[PDB]
Each structure stands twice: as C-alpha cells, then as structure tokens.
Amino acid sequence: SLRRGIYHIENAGVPSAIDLKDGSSSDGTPIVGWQFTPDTINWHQLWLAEPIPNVADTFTLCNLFSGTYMDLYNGSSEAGTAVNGWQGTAFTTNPHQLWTIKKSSDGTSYKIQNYGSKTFVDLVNGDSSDGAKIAGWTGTWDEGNPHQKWYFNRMSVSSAEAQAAIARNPHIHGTYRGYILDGEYLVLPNATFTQIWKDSGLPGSKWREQIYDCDDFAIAMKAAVGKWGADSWKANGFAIFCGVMLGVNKAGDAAHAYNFTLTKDHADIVFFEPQNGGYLNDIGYDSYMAFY
Amino acid sequence: SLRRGIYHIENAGVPSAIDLKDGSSSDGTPIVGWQFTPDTINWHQLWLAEPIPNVADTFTLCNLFSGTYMDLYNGSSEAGTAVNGWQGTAFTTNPHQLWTIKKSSDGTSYKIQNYGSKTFVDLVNGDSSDGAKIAGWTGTWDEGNPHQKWYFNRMSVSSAEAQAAIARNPHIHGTYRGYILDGEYLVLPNATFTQIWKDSGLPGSKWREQIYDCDDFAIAMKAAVGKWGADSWKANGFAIFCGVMLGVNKAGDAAHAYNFTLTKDHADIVFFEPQNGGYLNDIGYDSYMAFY
Ligand SMILES: C[C@@H]1O[C@@H](O[C@@H]2[C@@H](O[C@H]3O[C@H](CO)[C@H](O)[C@H](O)[C@H]3O)[C@@H](O)[C@@H](CO)O[C@@H]2O)[C@@H](O)[C@H](O)[C@@H]1O
Ligand SMILES: C[C@@H]1O[C@@H](O[C@@H]2[C@@H](O[C@H]3O[C@H](CO)[C@H](O)[C@H](O)[C@H]3O)[C@@H](O)[C@@H](CO)O[C@@H]2O)[C@@H](O)[C@H](O)[C@@H]1O
Ligand SMILES: C[C@@H]1O[C@@H](O[C@@H]2[C@@H](O[C@H]3O[C@H](CO)[C@H](O)[C@H](O)[C@H]3O)[C@@H](O)[C@@H](CO)O[C@@H]2O)[C@@H](O)[C@H](O)[C@@H]1O
Ligand SMILES: C[C@@H]1O[C@@H](O[C@@H]2[C@@H](O[C@H]3O[C@H](CO)[C@H](O)[C@H](O)[C@H]3O)[C@@H](O)[C@@H](CO)O[C@@H]2O)[C@@H](O)[C@H](O)[C@@H]1O
Ligand SMILES: C[C@@H]1O[C@@H](O[C@@H]2[C@@H](O[C@H]3O[C@H](CO)[C@H](O)[C@H](O)[C@H]3O)[C@@H](O)[C@@H](CO)O[C@H]2O)[C@@H](O)[C@H](O)[C@@H]1O
Ligand SMILES: C[C@@H]1O[C@@H](O[C@@H]2[C@@H](O[C@H]3O[C@H](CO)[C@H](O)[C@H](O)[C@H]3O)[C@@H](O)[C@@H](CO)O[C@H]2O)[C@@H](O)[C@H](O)[C@@H]1O
Ligand SMILES: [Ca+2]
Ligand SMILES: [Ca+2]
Ligand SMILES: [Ca+2]
Ligand SMILES: [Ca+2]
Ligand SMILES: [Cl-]
Ligand SMILES: [Cl-]
Ligand code: NA
Ligand code: NA
C-alpha cells in the first residue's frame, strides 16, 4: 500500500508530472501534465497523500502549494471528465476527492482510481506537452495502458525513516539521544536548503563568543527552515526536514553545534555547517544530541 | 570573591548606577552616576566582570552595550582622575583597565580599586544627580565612606545556576535531560522577554498541523532572543537566557513544546507559551527535554 507522504507523480509513458496549473487555489483549476526538473522543488507538482481510515488503499491528494485537493468534476464516470484542484479537507467523505491508489500490472507504477466513479486518472492521448489534459477515464486495474500509469516518487520521510538514516551514520556518539518533533518531512534538495540559508542572513553573521556562537547559528538555521515551510506551502500535515545536532570531537574536549539534512535517496544524513554553508559527510564531531 | 557575571552597580549612599554616558563606544566617554529603573534593562548600566587568571579578586569591567572597558585615565593616582570607557580586551594587562573588587567593611557592598593606581572608584561628593562625575580617589579598604561603596546587583546566571533553578521545579519529568549551550546568561525581565516576542512576529503566527505547530513556535522564540542578543549588545562572552522545553502531560498521551525564563531572584523557572505570550508557573506538562 502506498504510504502517507508527499509525492511527485510522474506518468509512466512520458516524463510529465501531475501539475496543478499555476499553483492556483481557485476551485476548478485544471490539473495537467507538465515537464519537471529533477533534484528541485517542483512547486506545483507535489501531492500530500492522506490515507482514509478504514478504507483500504484510498486517499485524498492535497496539492502542497495550493492546499486544494484533486477533484473529479461532479464525480462523473464519463471518459474525459475534468480532474481539477478544489477546496476540501484531508478526511473528506466527498467521493469526488477520494482516490484508490494501487500498483499497476508493472508492479512499479500505480493506477489512480476515483472512489466514486471507478474511473482512472488518465494523461489524455499520452500527450507530453506542457498543459496536456488529465481526465478521468474508463480503464481496468490490470491493463498496460501507460496513459493511466503513474510513478509515485516519494519526496518525504517519516520520522522513523529519518531516525533510521541517523542511526546508520558512523559519526554518532555513544551517548546520543534524538528528539523527534514532527511525523512526516519534506526532504529538500541541497540547492533549496542552501537558498534558505542564504536568504536567512546567516551568511553574513559573525561568530561571537557565547552571544552568537555555534549554537545560535544552528538554531537560527532551523528556525529559518521552519519559517520557510509555513510561508511557502498552504497544505498542512507535514514539516520540512532540518535538524540540529550537538556533537563532541574524538579527543573529547570540544563540542560543536551544526545542522543536518538527508541524501537524495533518503537513506543517509549529511551535515551542514551554518557558519559557512558547507555540506560534509564528516564534520569532525560525533553527535550526542539531535532535534528535528 | 565576586563571581564572573553581568552586574548593575549601584552606589551605596544614593540610588545612582555606574553609567557609561550615552552608551558611547568612543574612547574617553565619561562614566557617571545616573538614576535607574528597577526590573528593566538599564541599557547603559550593565557591566561584564571577567576574572583575570591568577590575579586574585581582579577583573576587567566591560560595558555590555558599548563593548568598551572601564578605564582610569592614564592610570593616575591623583584624586579626581577621570574614569571613562575605553577600547580594550577581556584579559588585558593594561592596569588602567584592571580593577580589584572586594567587599567593603559593611560586608554587602564592594569597593572598586584600580590595580595600577590603588585608588578607588568614587561617586564624587555623593552627588545623586544624573551625570555626576565618577573618579578615581584616595581611600582605604576598611573605611565607611559611601562615596566609594557599590552594590554589585547580579543580572546574569551561570549555567549551573540555571540548571539548579530547573531542578527545583515541580514540573520536571522523570526522564528529563537538559542540554546546556552557553556558560553565562543575562536574565531578562518579563517586560523585555515579551517585547522580543512581540517584535518576532510570533503573535501573528497561526498554529498549523506539523508545518507551524508548537515546536516551531518555541524554536522561533529562542532564535528571536538569540538574534536580539547579538543585535543589541556589543560585548561578547555571555548569552541571553531563553530555553526550549518539550513536555508530556500527566496522562502521558500528549506532548507540547514551549519556552522558559527565570524569576527575578534567579531561583526558579517560569514557563512561557509562545503561541500567546502567557507566563505560567504550571503549563500542564512535565518537561522531558530542555535546551538553553
Ligand atoms: C454532491 C455535492 O457534493 C459537494 O459539492 C461538490 C464539491 O465539493 C467540494 O467543494 C464544495 C464547494 O464547491 C464544498 O467546499 C465541499 O465541502 C467540497 O467537498 C466539488 O467536489 C464539486 C466539483 O467536483 O462537486 C460538488 O459541487 C457538496 O458541497 C454539495 O452540497 C453536494 O453534496
Ligand atoms: C492507443 C490506444 O491505447 C488504449 O486506448 C487509450 C484509452 O484507454 C482507455 O480507454 C479505452 C476507451 O476509450 C478502454 O477503456 C481502455 O481499456 C482504457 O485504458 C485512453 O487512455 C485514451 C485517453 O488517453 O487514450 C487511448 O485511446 C487502447 O485501448 C486502444 O486500443 C489503443 O491501443
Ligand atoms: C602606557 C600606555 O598604555 C596603553 O595606552 C593606554 C590606553 O590603552 C588602551 O587604549 C589604547 C588606544 O588608545 C590601546 O587600544 C590599548 O591596547 C588599550 O589598552 C588607555 O588605557 C589610555 C587611557 O587611560 O591610556 C593609555 O593611552 C598602550 O597602548 C600605550 O602604548 C602605552 O603603553
Ligand atoms: C564628607 C567627607 O567624607 C569623606 O571625604 C570624602 C572623600 O574621601 C576620600 O578622600 C579623602 C581625601 O579627599 C580621604 O582619602 C578619605 O579616606 C577617602 O575616602 C572623597 O570621597 C570625596 C569625593 O567624593 O568626598 C569626600 O571629601 C571624609 O574623609 C571627610 O572627612 C568627610 O567626612
Ligand atoms: C514557481 C514557478 O515554477 C516554475 O514554473 C512553473 C512550472 O514549473 C514546471 O515547469 C517548468 C517549465 O515550465 C520546469 O520544468 C519546472 O522544473 C517545473 O516545476 C509549472 O508548474 C507551471 C504550470 O503549473 O507553472 C509555472 O509557474 C518556474 O519555471 C518559475 O520560474 C517559477 O519558479
Ligand atoms: C537607551 C535609552 O535608555 C534610557 O535613557 C538612557 C539613560 O537611562 C537611564 O536613565 C533613565 C533616565 O534618564 C532611566 O532611569 C533609565 O531606567 C536608566 O537606564 C541613561 O543611561 C543615559 C546616560 O547614559 O542615556 C539615556 O539614553 C531611556 O530613557 C531612553 O528612552 C532609551 O531607551
Ligand atoms: Ca510537532
Ligand atoms: Ca550561544
Ligand atoms: Ca555556546
Ligand atoms: Ca513542526
Ligand atoms: Cl494490456
Ligand atoms: Cl570609616
Ligand atoms: Na560565515
Ligand atoms: Na497566538
């Protein structure tokens, strides 16, 4: 079963993503196929899948930027029916906004079925051009048709996944304790993480004994990423990944405070030095505490 | 012996504080007696006492706002010699900026003796008016003269003192761990702590599930107080007191993130709710983690 999380949803036949046109929160905004850039934030193309209680393999899909929901227009089972963004809520009973999402016969991509109509999300004619219609269409679960097949490229981690990545790192102190603050996190490309750092003012901050020293830099970076998250996205129910760590050197006589992020494959952490914007696989300290 | 820390230094005969006139960093800026407001930040009247290694009861005194040092003009032992702010460093060997500070014969106030001249800091004629001269003057350690006696009202806590205040609180979870980040902290009046909160933008922030929830508010408040500290004071070697706590309710099924500060007497903590600006002796949670 697809796990709760944020996804970039890519057609299996052509490299078009499911895109809420212009990110608009207006009701009836078309959802279309559009090209994308890997290892970026694709601002109009991220979707938060919320599982519905007690209803197997069925979800709402909330666009991260707009806060509005994937909606089959008037629930029609007619082939060609518009799929649009529309106001709703995460656990709605409106079948127009409920989607059963299960693996296709290729075992890798998924099909996306409206719970009311039993029709499928379809990139009409497999058209790869920017702005191509997506519609609800007749189909079957088992058929090959790539117009109706979608890769769910996972862009978030659960808190358990983040904890795993930390735990496999080789620079963790024997006394380490982690303090988990949220449940599901958008993982930033480093290019975005860096942009947040630049825009925070931290690049120009001077180190000062106690009054603006390593701990201040690290906390400020975290606060900046938290502020970015709220100011950037209208959906709720997720956080942005950015940790703080305290660590001690091998000799045991010096401590440091710094940040960390996750690799692209989500399997490992990478340390960030907020005093200079550097990413490091080894910062010279073993973490004894983290919060994220 | 006087402990390292930040002090408001008040004459024992009249309620005038040692004030660096207009907070000016210019060399030769007069240090004068001036009236003060209790339970405020007295912006030009705070002094960081740094003990000198191996030199008993002797200190530099750094004005917190200007970053410049109490300086006996040309080290003269003549009565009437100007005491002024002047550029220097925390561990200087310049005797003009070194001060032996020991209790007076009243056992409560201190006398302040220049290490080079052996003369004493003197509120000339005990004049209580705003801008009254302070000078180096002949004197003795044991005499009663209130012109040369000074109360060192302690405005900072060491990290050990903060840890003690936390440890005597009744709302600490059995699993509590604290993570200390600095050594010496200016304690804010609540009126200042609140002003920082107001100026941070947090009063207008909306709670949002995971993306701007309790943990974000608490971290943001801490970051705001850290930024205020650096932007407000030119001296180094101290931090501003502002903690973050994570806590769990009595039933064990809900957690919260919030801030804390210290009472005026420095002996107890007080919880601050960054979602509404409230101070509470009981926030409804027992702290399982704190960083400060
Ligand atoms: C059958 C119809 O269902 C609901 O209306 C839906 C729309 O539902 C969504 O938007 C409306 C506002 O237009 C409202 O906010 C609702 O809570 C939300 O779920 C929407 O799905 C459109 C497009 O497919 O179709 C229907 O208009 C309900 O509001 C109506 O009263 C009625 O029961
Ligand atoms: C090229 C074409 O691919 C398949 O047709 C698709 C459509 O397939 C879906 O609709 C048809 C009915 O129109 C039938 O229900 C099929 O099982 C279902 O997957 C649909 O994807 C549309 C819009 O994108 O495009 C193509 O017409 C195939 O069935 C056709 O025979 C033909 O090979
Ligand atoms: C004997 C004299 O001592 C030092 O000069 C002091 C001044 O010292 C302070 O300021 C100067 C700049 O004016 C410099 O930054 C120095 O490091 C700092 O300690 C000051 O104490 C004034 C007023 O009392 O008196 C003397 O000018 C030293 O710089 C001189 O070379 C000389 O050794
Ligand atoms: C009212 C006055 O108080 C004392 O005189 C002080 C001064 O005291 C200091 O200087 C005198 C020499 O001028 C002597 O060295 C004394 O031990 C020392 O404390 C001084 O504080 C000045 C400037 O503020 O004011 C007064 O003159 C006392 O000695 C006088 O007899 C007289 O009672
Ligand atoms: C926020 C906005 O994002 C980009 O434009 C989006 C656009 O983004 C996708 O397509 C462009 C090419 O048009 C690139 O492949 C991006 O990597 C994709 O994410 C689409 O989402 C459309 C339709 O909704 O809206 C545009 O606003 C970017 O080109 C803009 O500069 C801007 O940053
Ligand atoms: C930063 C500045 O602080 C206050 O003026 C200071 C002044 O502050 C002291 O005296 C005033 C009365 O003049 C009150 O008692 C304050 O509680 C004291 O802290 C002195 O430090 C003088 C001389 O150095 O400089 C003034 O700038 C305040 O009145 C100003 O509004 C302002 O906030
Ligand atoms: Ca949370
Ligand atoms: Ca600090
Ligand atoms: Ca520190
Ligand atoms: Ca959060
Ligand atoms: Cl088939
Ligand atoms: Cl006497
Ligand atoms: Na830097
Ligand atoms: Na509020």
Numbering used by the authors:
A (entry chain A), B (entry chain A): 2 to 293
What is the paper's account of this structure, in its own sentences?
The Marasmius oreades agglutinin (MOA) is a 293 amino acid, homodimeric, histo-blood-group-B specific chimerolectin extracted from the fruiting bodies of the common fairy ring mushroom. Each MOA protomer is composed of two domains, accounting for the lectin’s sugar-binding and proteolytic functions, respectively. The proteolytic activity is associated to the C- terminal α+β dimerization domain, which closely resembles the consensus papain fold (r.m.s.d.: 2.2 Å), including the Cys/His catalytic dyad (Cys215, His257). In contrast to other known PLCPs, the proteolytic domain of MOA carries a binuclear calcium binding site.
The different orientations of Z-VAD-fmk were defined as ‘direct’ or ‘inverted’, depending on whether the VAD peptide was aligned with (‘direct’) or against (‘inverted’) the standard backbone orientation of a PLCP substrate. Consistent with known Z-VAD-fmk-bound complexes, the inhibitor molecule binds to the active site of MOA forming a thioether with the catalytic cysteine (Cys215). In the ‘direct’ orientation, the inhibitor molecule extends along the MOA dimerization interface, interacting with both protomers. The carbonyl group of the aspartate residue lies within hydrogen bonding distance of the backbone NH group of the catalytic cysteine (3.0 Å) and the indole NH of Trp208 (3.0 Å). The aspartate side chain of the inhibitor points away from the catalytic cleft, and forms a hydrogen bond with the backbone carbonyl oxygen of Ala256 (3.2 Å), which also engages in a hydrogen bonding interaction with the Asp backbone NH group (3.3 Å). The adjacent carbonyl group in the Ala-Asp peptide group interacts strongly with the solvent-exposed Ca2+ ion (2.3 Å), replacing a water molecule present in the calcium-bound structure of MOA. The side chain of the alanine moiety of the VAD peptidyl group snugly fits into a hydrophobic cavity lined by residues Leu247, Ala258 and Leu182# (‘#’ denotes a residue provided by the symmetry-related protomer). The carbonyl group of the Val-Ala peptide group contacts the backbone NH of Ala256 through a water-mediated interaction (Z-VAD-fmk-Ala3(O)/HOH: 2.4 Å). Based on the structural alignment with papain, Z-VAD-fmk occupies either the unprimed (S1-S3, ‘direct’ conformation) or the primed (S1’-S3’, ‘inverted’ conformation) subsites on the catalytic cleft of MOA. The S2 specificity pocket of MOA is defined by the P2 alanine side chain of Z-VAD-fmk.
